[PDB]
Ligand binder design. Structure first.
Ligand SMILES: CC(=O)Nc1ccc2oc(-c3ccnc(C(=O)N4CCN([C@H](c5ccccc5)c5nnn(C)n5)CC4)c3)nc2c1
Ligand SMILES: CC(=O)Nc1ccc2oc(-c3ccnc(C(=O)N4CCN([C@H](c5ccccc5)c5nnn(C)n5)CC4)c3)nc2c1
Ligand SMILES: CC(=O)Nc1ccc2oc(-c3ccnc(C(=O)N4CCN([C@H](c5ccccc5)c5nnn(C)n5)CC4)c3)nc2c1
Ligand SMILES: *[C@@H]1O[C@H](CO)[C@@H](O[C@@H]2O[C@H](CO)[C@@H](O)[C@H](O)[C@H]2NC(C)=O)[C@H](O)[C@H]1NC(C)=O
Ligand SMILES: *[C@@H]1O[C@H](CO)[C@@H](O[C@@H]2O[C@H](CO)[C@@H](O)[C@H](O)[C@H]2NC(C)=O)[C@H](O)[C@H]1NC(C)=O
Ligand SMILES: *[C@@H]1O[C@H](CO)[C@@H](O[C@@H]2O[C@H](CO)[C@@H](O)[C@H](O)[C@H]2NC(C)=O)[C@H](O)[C@H]1NC(C)=O
Ligand SMILES: *[C@@H]1O[C@H](CO)[C@@H](O[C@@H]2O[C@H](CO)[C@@H](O)[C@H](O)[C@H]2NC(C)=O)[C@H](O)[C@H]1NC(C)=O
Ligand SMILES: *[C@@H]1O[C@H](CO)[C@@H](O[C@@H]2O[C@H](CO)[C@@H](O)[C@H](O)[C@H]2NC(C)=O)[C@H](O)[C@H]1NC(C)=O
Ligand SMILES: *[C@@H]1O[C@H](CO)[C@@H](O[C@@H]2O[C@H](CO)[C@@H](O)[C@H](O)[C@H]2NC(C)=O)[C@H](O)[C@H]1NC(C)=O
Ligand SMILES: *[C@@H]1O[C@H](CO)[C@@H](O)[C@H](O)[C@H]1NC(C)=O
Ligand SMILES: *[C@@H]1O[C@H](CO)[C@@H](O)[C@H](O)[C@H]1NC(C)=O
Ligand SMILES: *[C@@H]1O[C@H](CO)[C@@H](O)[C@H](O)[C@H]1NC(C)=O
Ligand SMILES: *[C@@H]1O[C@H](CO)[C@@H](O)[C@H](O)[C@H]1NC(C)=O
Ligand SMILES: *[C@@H]1O[C@H](CO)[C@@H](O)[C@H](O)[C@H]1NC(C)=O
Ligand SMILES: *[C@@H]1O[C@H](CO)[C@@H](O)[C@H](O)[C@H]1NC(C)=O
Lengths: 176, 324, 324, 176, 324, 176
């Protein structure tokens, strides 16, 4: 993908996350589980809904072929009528098919972008209070209970609250 | 000891829906929306309750002139659209040509109902024979007949007096008026039927200034006849009158058509017949009942229809790339 | 102690300009460029200094034939474009038809100036009455008159000698030549006006081979007349001659039009009149003075114009998403 | 946005930066202020200018409707003339409207990309000589005066010159 | 001590190929694919082995009627396409007009081969002079002649008996049949050539019902002649017959054209001549031999051709931005 | 570029890498050299090949002008025939030219994306076992021989195998 997240550094999808397009898997002392990120999922739903409606509404005023008849000595204008109507049908078929191809590429890349941005949202929250394992996961240098996980998910993680405990774990690891 | 983890991921499912892109084909996605209608019921149906005029084996000309093999259509109710076969077998049973026929059919594209009315009764021809204009090329029930809406006039007592007749359109609606002229084989037939060697037909309205002369030629027998009938039409406006003068070869009006309802209509070429169904979107191959914005059934449609494309497949990705 | 900081950011302002995208509508941006012209001055104006021919209540036919109610247009200067109402009231004051009228108007789309010249003086008709071809259907100042550019010829002393006349186009320019034929009501009128029962009008050039015959029919009175006038035109090329022969029913030329300037022109349907303004782009609703590349005023324009679209709004983002 | 910078990890715009689309806010012992980045701003101006001119110039050769008249028995060709001219107007309206929608999306994402790349330009200059606060800002581990700020802005920051002072601050912090 | 390094990079080369984008022009790339054909061999060539009919200085009418200056085309083999100059100098050597000429050329667009056959031998005219219908306007080798495929019939012993002739299309193929009528200058010439003052030509098939009358007018001399010839055509279907009757002014058929091969063809306007080459794609400016999908040579092509665009340049990037 | 790699944080191309679009330059005790990354290069070749074929195949059903002739009194329908055929030629020229402009932008950005993703692929493999110099290069905190380089190139680098040696080098550097 253009943005390197989907089928990229996050190798595959989660069959176990059924209520959303993007989200989190957490693992702490209280247990483990999936939570869809509702905000990014909802922005994506709005985006794609607008895209489909825009595609249908732009194709609203397209050519409507009309039946016309000509006698045996009006062959020039019958042929003109035929190339005119077929010409417009070819134009609108091209527009429809191409718009679908281009917009499909953009939709797939849009999902990819959304996953990358959700990842970066967590990464820029946690900073050095967690270790980036390189596969979409972070390993916390401190204990992160369900309230802490929820704070990361909903964008209210408190880096200074844990920075001391995390710094102590980091120094412990970098000393051996 | 293993620290707590949080991971970012995306959805995967068992979906096998595929879409295409510029750079890649057959991309499996978790969700997609097909936007192309590809099916039809293969039937000719009513259009929002309004039945079509299905002419069966008759043509538009056979209908409006009153081909005796087309008595099914002597008085047809309001239609939504008209269905004509490619080569109807009941057309001009007496061979000839319809003048400006395609322009007339084009007017029919804008009409939903006719009320046939009598303008010149068949009995009011006192100087001319009105019940002798029959032919074996226009048979009815094994007996010679003719177009029912026009009157083939013949000489009476070896004389053909100058016809001078007029009709005033008192109706509040426009009137389609039909008539014609007979081109016989040779001078012997001309004298046989109309006495007068040189004849004409002058027709005039507020706008029309017509004078037809019977052309004589030796022609091939078509449906057993070498003479020809050339038919004509006009639209007599309300409070206007049409005037006919002729000393022979005159196919006079008897019935004319009152255009009671104008609207959106079309003439549809199809070999199908009535299907006893209802639809809001009709093609010459069958009716469409669909919420999808596009269809590829047939470009000529009528009703509330999807937009036609020549595509075999239009599918929009809505979800994301589905991993195996 | 608080370390030094450097931050990366982007511009925001108080702008309320909005644009649309595929995925989102009404996106406020810091900067945008409207590219759709939506206003016009609602007036008919000169086109780069050149005034239009505004025919007011006259039609093209009324102008070129010389309807007496159209003396305003006896000699019109060079025009940029022509403006005709939808249903001009001064058309064929004597009822009839103009032959190949739409093709003639189409030629007018390629002409900017006429020089009217006299080809057959009204006095040079010695065997025929030239000053009697007047009607009450073509009144002027309460007296009967006729089209000023053509001469309605009448029998003289109950005789109508064979007219044989020719005009040689000595001018270096092409010439528009107009004439006509009179279709009377009945034989009594034919004899009354032209004596000769059967008449004709043969017209010939290097390319034309015409022979018109007066058709007689009983027609509705239009502007008080049941006879009809059928008018004709041709383009006599330089060093070519036109030849007329006729024993009656002849509406002879008097004035013909020299095509002095060809160029880009158009016939514009509009009920507006002159606005005493100047513009480089004109529509039938009003003139456009605009630097924007698109407009939605009216598809039929002339001059240096933006490109027409049916859009209500075309706005390009140039800046970025404006945060509240 | 596709690139996650505008209204993303940089939460909002700067009403106080009036002379450019992208730039910097600095804060050091000599004071604080805004400076627009002229290079990235100028590339963006060139890009959008070319885009607008390209849109106008591609719409240069579009259909021009011509007045045509037909009599009462030329209704088939009058109708053909009408569907032909209306057909081309519908085609060119679709092209104009769609091109504007698609190009507007691309323009907004282009700005977003430019902000992300300006951010990464600074980040890849500073490396571990500064701390990434996660909101578009860097906190220097060393003193960075106006000449140092200017060196970061114009792409000539000297990482080895400050790497020792910065390393000493980092070790001081990671020791508590 | 300097640690080991691994670096990520991209390709650069010495390429100077440039492409354009929405936001930037003249972007040097490492690889590109030109997709626009811009060259042609400037010659008229065979189309997949099949030579064209190159009419040189003759027109379609001059060919099919048998202009004596067009003996090169008395029997032309099967062609792929036809090449006609803009203003061929050998057209109607005797001035006149070809009826429905453009519709006939349109039929020629769908024909690849004619077999000329004799339908009415020049000798079988016993009551009429068949070898006297020659003119100096149609010279051959310094002597007066005429169109070779039609017979100008003249009175015999100051009498012109009523011609009644018929031809039955026994061939299994459709037949193009040509004839004509002569419009003389005045009554003196009419009597001189055909005796009978008033004449006609009635032509009839299964569908045709024609009756032509010679129009008389004083016309300009064209190629030395003031009389005119009006020519006519029809398509006689297999097992149909055509019937002619006439008492003068009749340009009778002699040869008619059997349509042996229908297919894809075109009439190409070009001043070029045969180039002794072969191609699969032909334009009026020259032939195209190209694998590229687009071309800008000329919109009117025939054969297996690229798609025409009005572009001066279509180049697709395939590689990446090439750094200096 | 949209993705900031090509002519971005990687300042220029490699005239010395002749067998591919993207790849690696390595430098270790066993010597130095160029290796094209065959997987990303091949995906790019497939992508662009599909794009060119799609462009040609979508332009398959475009308008074919037909010769038509009209006499001197058929000027209205001759003009209609002319505006109809020229109208379709203008439409298809616009489609061709625009599709090429838009797709050229996308192709250049596609290459840029591929370079960025190849970079991130290595970065997320190496993590803190190497130093990011900010110009497309990584400096290893441990010895990386030709088998180790090959493991990074083909996506099978073993972070735990070297994490101890690397940690020892990092601690040595951060102590001075
Ligand atoms: C005539 C016509 O076809 N009109 C039309 C118009 C506009 C449309 O917009 C859409 C459309 C948009 C966006 N998404 C989905 C879609 O495919 N969805 C399936 C997945 N579903 C996810 C979803 C994701 C993963 C698992 C389960 C559900 C979801 N639902 N609710 N949430 C919070 N997330 C969202 C909707 C569908 N279809 C449309 C169809
Ligand atoms: C008929 C027609 O409309 N033709 C046409 C053609 C091409 C155009 O290109 C543009 C166009 C391009 C790029 N940008 C802006 C724009 O909106 N600007 C406003 C903001 N301004 C910023 C700017 C940004 C933020 C604050 C203040 C100024 C700027 N100015 N100078 N610098 C260094 N930066 C740049 C120009 C505008 N308009 C165009 C209009
Ligand atoms: C009528 C017509 O033109 N049809 C048509 C259809 C489809 C096409 O697809 C392409 C096309 C695709 C993708 N790439 C290149 C291209 O320009 N290449 C040159 C560079 N080359 C690189 C390459 C890159 C850098 C240096 C050397 C070679 C390569 N070759 N092999 N590998 C592993 N890498 C790839 C192919 C070219 N041309 C096409 C042409
Ligand atoms: C985001 O998650 C945090 C949990 O970490 C929620 O914080 C709690 O908010 C309530 C008020 O609604 C307080 O009374 C609690 O004390 C908070 N708990 C903690 C641990 O801070 C927060 O509400 C969540 N936000 C949303 C929108 O759900
Ligand atoms: C048809 O008959 C009506 C009356 O029976 C005629 O009505 C006149 O119409 C003309 C317009 O053509 C008006 O000027 C008159 O005022 C009308 N008179 C009346 C009494 O209604 C009508 O003219 C007749 N149609 C024709 C063609 O003569
Ligand atoms: C109109 O008059 C001019 C001379 O007054 C005629 O001029 C001749 O034109 C013909 C071509 O039609 C030339 O062949 C002659 O050489 C010209 N002669 C002269 C003296 O100029 C012209 O023929 C006349 N037009 C017609 C139709 O007869
Ligand atoms: C970029 O910023 C630096 C300031 O950090 C400028 O460096 C100075 O350059 C001049 C020469 O023009 C030297 O004489 C000074 O000694 C430099 N100062 C330092 C602290 O290095 C540099 O000129 C700036 N570049 C641009 C293009 O403005
Ligand atoms: C041409 O001649 C053939 C026989 O020489 C005629 O053939 C007849 O064609 C008609 C149809 O028009 C059939 O009904 C007959 O059965 C045919 N008879 C035979 C013996 O073949 C044909 O009619 C002739 N053409 C014309 C116009 O008379
Ligand atoms: C990727 O590179 C590594 C070298 O680091 C290759 O690993 C070797 O694989 C073979 C089996 O094919 C083993 O027998 C060797 O012991 C491996 N060496 C090491 C150092 O692990 C690996 O084969 C490469 N993969 C590909 C597809 O080329
Ligand atoms: C995509 O899959 C279909 C089968 O569903 C196949 O017929 C088609 O050829 C495939 N397209 C390509 C480009 O391989
Ligand atoms: C259209 O088809 C659906 C089945 O796909 C059916 O449920 C519905 O009733 C149909 N609509 C009408 C108006 O018959
Ligand atoms: C966008 O805003 C306008 C008001 O300026 C409003 O009329 C329009 O409905 C809005 N569009 C949508 C899709 O909400
Ligand atoms: C066009 O309008 C502007 C005002 O928007 C005015 O300043 C200008 O003078 C006008 N141009 C002409 C040629 O009248
Ligand atoms: C691009 O380069 C060509 C020369 O190859 C030049 O003629 C053209 O003007 C240039 N285009 C622009 C926009 O500068
Ligand atoms: C087409 O041109 C090429 C040279 O570009 C030549 O090699 C080839 O033989 C030509 N094809 C034919 C069929 O003449």
């Amino acid at each position: 993908g253009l943005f390197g997240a989907i089928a990229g550094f996050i190798e595959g999808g989660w069959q176990g996350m059924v209520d959303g397009w993007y989200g989190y898997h957490h693992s702490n002392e209280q247990g483990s589980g999936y939570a869809a990120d509702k905000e990014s999922t909802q922005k994506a739903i709005d985006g794609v809904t607008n895209k489909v409606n825009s595609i249908i509404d732009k194709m609203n005023t397209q050519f409507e072929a009309v039946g016309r008849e000509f006698n045996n000595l009006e062959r020039r204008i019958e042929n003109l009528n035929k190339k005119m109507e077929d010409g417009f049908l070819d134009v609108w078929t091209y527009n429809a098919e191409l718009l679908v191809l281009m917009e499909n590429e953009r939709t797939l890349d849009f999902h990819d972008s959304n996953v990358k941005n959700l990842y970066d949202k967590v990464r820029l929250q946690l900073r050095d209070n967690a270790k980036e394992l390189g596969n979409g996961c972070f390993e916390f240098y401190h204990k992160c209970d369900n309230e802490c996980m929820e704070s990361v998910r909903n964008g209210t993680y408190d880096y200074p609250q844990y920075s001391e405990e995390a710094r102590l774990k980091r120094e412990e690891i970098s000393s051996g | 000891d293993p620290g707590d983890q949080i991971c970012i991921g995306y959805h995967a499912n068992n979906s096998t829906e595929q879409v295409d892109t510029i750079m890649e084909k057959n991309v499996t996605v978790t969700h997609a929306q097909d936007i192309l209608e590809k099916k039809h019921n293969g039937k000719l149906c009513d259009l929002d309750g309004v039945k079509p005029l299905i002419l069966r084996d008759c043509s538009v000309a056979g209908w409006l002139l009153g081909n005796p093999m087309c008595d099914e259509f002597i008085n047809v109710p309001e239609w939504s659209y008209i269905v004509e076969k490619a080569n109807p077998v009941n057309d001009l049973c007496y061979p000839g040509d319809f003048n400006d026929y395609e322009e007339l059919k084009h007017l029919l594209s804008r009409i939903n109902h006719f009320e046939k009315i009598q303008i010149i009764p068949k009995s009011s021809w006192s100087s001319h024979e009105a019940s002798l204009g029959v032919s074996s090329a226009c048979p009815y029930q094994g007996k010679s007949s003719f177009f029912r809406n026009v009157v083939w006039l013949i000489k009476k007592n070896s004389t053909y007096p100058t016809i001078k007749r007029s009709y005033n359109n008192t109706n509040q609606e426009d009137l389609l008026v039909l008539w014609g002229i007979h081109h016989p084989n040779d001078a012997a037939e001309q004298t046989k039927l109309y006495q007068n060697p040189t004849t004409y037909i002058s027709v005039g309205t507020s706008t029309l200034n017509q004078r037809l002369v019977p052309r004589i030629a030796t022609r091939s027998k078509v449906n057993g006849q070498s003479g020809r009938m050339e038919f004509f039409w006009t639209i007599l406006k309300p409070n206007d009158a049409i005037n006919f003068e002729s000393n022979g070869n005159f196919i006079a009006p008897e019935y004319a058509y009152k255009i009671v309802k104008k609207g959106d209509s079309t003439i549809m070429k199809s070999e199908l017949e009535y299907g006893n169904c209802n639809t809001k979107c009709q093609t010459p191959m069958g009716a469409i009942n669909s919420s999808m914005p596009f269809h590829n059934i047939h470009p000529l449609t009528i009703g509330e229809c999807p937009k036609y494309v020549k595509s075999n497949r239009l599918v929009l990705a809505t979800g994301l790339r589905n991993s195996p």
